[PDB]
Amino acid sequence: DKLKKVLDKLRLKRKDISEAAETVNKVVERLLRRMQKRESEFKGVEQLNTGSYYEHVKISAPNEFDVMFKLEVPRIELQEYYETGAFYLVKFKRINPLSHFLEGEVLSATKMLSKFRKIIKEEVKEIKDIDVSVEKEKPGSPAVTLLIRNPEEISVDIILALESKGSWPISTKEGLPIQGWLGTKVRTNLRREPFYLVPKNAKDGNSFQGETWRLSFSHTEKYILNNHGIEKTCCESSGAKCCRKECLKLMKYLLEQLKKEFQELDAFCSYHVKTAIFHMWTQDPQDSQWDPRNLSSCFDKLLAFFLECLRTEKLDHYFIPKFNLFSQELIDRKSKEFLSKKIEYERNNGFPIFDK
Amino acid sequence: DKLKKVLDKLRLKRKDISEAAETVNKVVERLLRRMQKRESEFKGVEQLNTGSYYEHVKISAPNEFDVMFKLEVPRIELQEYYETGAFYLVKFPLSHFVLSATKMLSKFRKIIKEEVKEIKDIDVSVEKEKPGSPAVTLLIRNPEEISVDIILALESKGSWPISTKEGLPIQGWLGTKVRTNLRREPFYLVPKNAKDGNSFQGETWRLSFSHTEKYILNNHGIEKTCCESSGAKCCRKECLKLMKYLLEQLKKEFQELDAFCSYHVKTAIFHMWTQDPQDSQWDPRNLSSCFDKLLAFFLECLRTEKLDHYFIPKFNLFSQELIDRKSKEFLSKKIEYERNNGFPIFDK
DNA sequence: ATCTGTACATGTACAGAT
DNA sequence: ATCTGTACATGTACAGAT
DNA sequence: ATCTGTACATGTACAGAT
DNA sequence: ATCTGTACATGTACAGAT
Ligand SMILES: Nc1ncnc2c1ncn2[C@@H]1O[C@H](COP(=O)(O)OP(=O)(O)OP(=O)(O)O)[C@@H](O)[C@H]1O
Ligand SMILES: Nc1ncnc2c1ncn2[C@@H]1O[C@H](COP(=O)(O)OP(=O)(O)OP(=O)(O)O)[C@@H](O)[C@H]1O
Ligand SMILES: [Mn+2]
Ligand SMILES: [Mn+2]
Ligand SMILES: [Mn+2]
Ligand SMILES: [Mn+2]
Ligand SMILES: [Zn+2]
Numbered sequence: 139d140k141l142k143k144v145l146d147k148l149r150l151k152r153k154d155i156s157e158a159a160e161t162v163n164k165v166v167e168r169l170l171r172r173m174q175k176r177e178s179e180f181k182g183v184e185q186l187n188t189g190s191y192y193e194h195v196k197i198s199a200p201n202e203f204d205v206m207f208k209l210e211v212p213r214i215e216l217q218e219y220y221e222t223g224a225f226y227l228v229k230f231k232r233i234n235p236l237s238h239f240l241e242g243e244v245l246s247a248t249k250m251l252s253k254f255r256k257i258i259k260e261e262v263k264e265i266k267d268i269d270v271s272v273e274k275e276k277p278g279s280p281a282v283t284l285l286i287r288n289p290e291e292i293s294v295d296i297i298l299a300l301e302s303k304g305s306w307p308i309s310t311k312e313g314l315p316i317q318g319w320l321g322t323k324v325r326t327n328l329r330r331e332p333f334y335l336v337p338k339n340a341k342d343g344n345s346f347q348g349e350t351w352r353l354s355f356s357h358t359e360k361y362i363l364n365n366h367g368i369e370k371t372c373c374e375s376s377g378a379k380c381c382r383k384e385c386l387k388l389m390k391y392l393l394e395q396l397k398k399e400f401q402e403l404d405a406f407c408s409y410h411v412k413t414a415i416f417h418m419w420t421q422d423p424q425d426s427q428w429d430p431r432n433l434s435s436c437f438d439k440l441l442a443f444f445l446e447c448l449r450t451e452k453l454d455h456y457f458i459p460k461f462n463l464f465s466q467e468l469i470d471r472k473s474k475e476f477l478s479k480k481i482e483y484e485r486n487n488g489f490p491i492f493d494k
Numbered sequence: 495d496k497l498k499k500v501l502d503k504l505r506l507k508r509k510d511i512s513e514a515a516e517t518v519n520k521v522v523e524r525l526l527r528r529m530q531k532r533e534s535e536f537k538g539v540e541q542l543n544t545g546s547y548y549e550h551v552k553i554s555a556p557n558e559f560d561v562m563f564k565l566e567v568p569r570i571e572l573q574e575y576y577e578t579g580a581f582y583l584v585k586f587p588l589s590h591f592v593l594s595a596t597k598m599l600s601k602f603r604k605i606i607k608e609e610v611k612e613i614k615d616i617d618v619s620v621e622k623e624k625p626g627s628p629a630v631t632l633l634i635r636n637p638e639e640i641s642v643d644i645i646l647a648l649e650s651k652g653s654w655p656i657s658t659k660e661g662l663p664i665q666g667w668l669g670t671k672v673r674t675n676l677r678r679e680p681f682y683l684v685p686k687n688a689k690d691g692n693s694f695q696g697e698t699w700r701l702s703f704s705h706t707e708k709y710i711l712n713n714h715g716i717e718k719t720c721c722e723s724s725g726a727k728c729c730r731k732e733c734l735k736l737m738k739y740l741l742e743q744l745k746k747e748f749q750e751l752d753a754f755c756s757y758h759v760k761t762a763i764f765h766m767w768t769q770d771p772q773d774s775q776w777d778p779r780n781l782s783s784c785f786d787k788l789l790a791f792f793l794e795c796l797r798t799e800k801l802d803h804y805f806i807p808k809f810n811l812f813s814q815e816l817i818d819r820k821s822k823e824f825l826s827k828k829i830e831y832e833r834n835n836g837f838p839i840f841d842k
Numbered sequence: 843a844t845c846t847g848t849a850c851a852t853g854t855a856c857a858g859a860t
Numbered sequence: 861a862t863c864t865g866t867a868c869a870t871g872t873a874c875a876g877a878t
Numbered sequence: 879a880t881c882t883g884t885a886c887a888t889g890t891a892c893a894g895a896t
Numbered sequence: 897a898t899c900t901g902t903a904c905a906t907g908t909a910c911a912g913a914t
């Protein structure tokens with residue numbers, strides 16, 4: 139009931155959705171069309187909407203949209219980057235519009251991203267209907283981010299992705315453990331869909347920096363978010379409603395509110411809570427372990443699970459089991475203990491950060 | 495325990511499946527070849543396997559197989575025949591055939607008969623044509639008797655006909671998303687090959703949802719994991735097998751049941767699966783009461799003379815027009831007897 | 843004349859609104 | 861409870877191309 | 879256009895375990 | 897008696913090659 143009111147605060151307004159989507163779809167459509175023009179290296183690129191807004195777990199406002207511009211690259215060979223599981227070099231087999239981004243048969247990611255960014259920047263210049271600019275590049279980001287002032291501020295991440303239709307890389311063989319929850323047929327069908335590669339774009343100074351790509355499963359996460367129950371009728375008009383998405387929203391909002399205040403939490407991002415709850419949904423497969431009447435204890439057990447991931451320094455990528463999002467190389471102990479304490483304080487004092 | 499032993503009897507043998515299928519697949523691949531490996535009107539026909547063998551509810555022997563040869567036809571107008579729900583006139587390569595079902599079936603049949611004639615490695619012939627059948631039926635002996643029904647079908651990719659809008663009522667069982675996706679698939683038309691002497695009989699086709707029934711049979715739980723390797727077994731298919739066996743055994747003995755077919759049983763269990771959607775209502779420990787509830791539901795269908803097409807609800811398969819009252823009362827008496835005596839007919 | 847990539851046309855699950 | 865805007869899957873029309 | 883290759887669903891069969 | 901793990905078998909979706 140206390141959490142029932144927070145969700146009411148977090149709920150998007152149709153008026154805002156309508157206003158924001160009108161602008162966003164206009165800008166996205168124009169950019170998609172410019173990539174189809176001339177001898178553009180990105181001709182054939184197709185659009186895939188992803189992220190919280192299209193999973194219906196966007197909270198507070200419709201002010202951030204994620205969209206994949208995906209390009210199918212056939213006849214592709216991958217080299218895993220130093221057994222990390224998630225990062226790859228991409229290589230080609232013949233001697234192609236990606237000609238100008240090739241090196242030693244190796245597809246440069248920062249070369250491709252730069253050209254992609256240059257096209258988007260020029261196209262944005264010739265929009266005089268909407269107040270829209272291109273954000274300064276961020277290290278580690280695979281995206282060209284648009285800032286729309288619709289009056290209201292709106293971010294759009296245009297994510298460049300390679301699309302391979304072959305079978306998924308073996309580092310994912312033990313990932314996606316949905317057998318006891320969504321089952322073997324769903325798992326088999328999901329793994330028949332393409333996989334995606336986005337630029338790592340780390341800028342950190344290490345070898346292969348500009349030629350490292352990162353696996354993306356945004357499309358698989360979108361399907362799961364929207365087909366999340368063991369029962370096919372879960373959250374449908376002739377079935378029972380669960381509180382799975384509501385628990386994600388509350389967890390997202392806790393991290394968002396804390397990150398707004400404490401810049402010690404810069405290492406953390408909402409993908410961490412999204413990954414955590416995919417494990418909770420696998421651990422607790424039954425729709426009855428997510429009854430809306432038990433929202434408080436369902437949110438609590440998610441917090442307890444997240445706190446144990448922070449303390450034990452282990453939050454395995456849901457799709458790549460050997461990739462630890464909470465490794466020391468990515469987040470130091472200090473950052474994790476700080477978040478542990480901040481969460482435990484919220485937990486134990488009525489969630490006062492929900493009232494800010 | 496009695497029912498478990500019956501199901502052990504009904505179970506097909508790996509060796510039998512392997513010998514029957516490699517011969518059936520030989521013949522079918524060759525007919526499918528001929529259909530487009532010639533300037534025939536059926537160039538572009540594609541194969542779709544259907545029926546109990548491919549749903550894994552075939553019982554006793556692998557001795558009957560069903561195959562659709564389906565052909566895409568663009569821009570066709572349907573016209574419902576006299577409000578029957580299931581039967582239609584088709585209208586606008588094939589212009590040798592208003593699209594007459596009788597005219598198309600016969601050329602299709604003539605092709606198959608010719609290709610069967612030039613098969614020398616398998617003992618195979620074409621059964622005499624049956625009024626009422628949309629099929630060309632092949633008889634194989636290797637030495638086991640095996641019959642194959644080659645079913646000609648038109649494939650339309652528009653919205654399903656209006657008479658189905660109330661059909662397929664899976665919303666509380668498989669859900670709205672499965673229903674919407676199933677209805678995004680094509681719908682099929684097959685010949686109505688009756689000789690009854692009625693008016694438009696020769697150019698009427700009948701709706702087929704064999705493709706949709708296959709998906710259901712193999713995606714039948716309310717839980718996605720039903721009968722999967724990380725899920726629980728249910729006894730839904732076993733119940734269909736048992737009810738199928740009861741009717742097969744009765745039809746063997748009683749000529750009075752010639753009007754009944756396994757599709758009646760299949761239809762009745764689709765309604766029971768919709769009435770009782772929870773997988774726990776089909777627990778394997780409760781096989782007996784599950785079988786009994788199917789019997790009771792089937793008997794209520796007989797008693798009220800009402801068994802609606804699961805996809806076309808106004809089409810009553812138990813109409814007085816199609817099955818006489820005395821047939822239904824005869825079958826009622828025989829089922830009530832088997833029920834009340836421990837199913838003696840299951841022991842022979 | 844026919845061919846075809848682009849985009850309209852149709853239908854409905856999701857979830858906010860009343 | 862019903863009404864309703866957006867997203868999205870798939871079927872089809874046709875301007876401009878061949 | 880056609881056809882093989884791959885992966886894993888659905889089954890049956892059976893020994894060893896419970 | 898049933899359950900579980902491995903072996904053995906066919907069916908079917910679709911990527912990629914030719
Ligand atoms: N570090 C990451 N590793 C893998 N995938 C990621 C990562 N960060 C983001 N993604 C993918 O990109 C999508 C968009 O990311 P984003 O940061 O906008 O979050 P979101 O899930 O849309 O939620 P919100 O925008 O409301 O914070 C995610 O849903 C996820 O699929
Ligand atoms: N009267 C009918 N109306 C509609 N569809 C039918 C009818 N009879 C058969 N079919 C379709 O054709 C398929 C093949 O029918 P068939 O008579 O071979 O039975 P079956 O379901 O395969 O089982 P079995 O052959 O083991 O009795 C059916 O499963 C169904 O999809
Ligand atoms: Mn986002
Ligand atoms: Mn983003
Ligand atoms: Mn059959
Ligand atoms: Mn048949
Ligand atoms: Zn749900």
Ligand SMILES: [Zn+2]
Nearest residue numbers: 715720721728
């Ligand atoms: Zn089952």
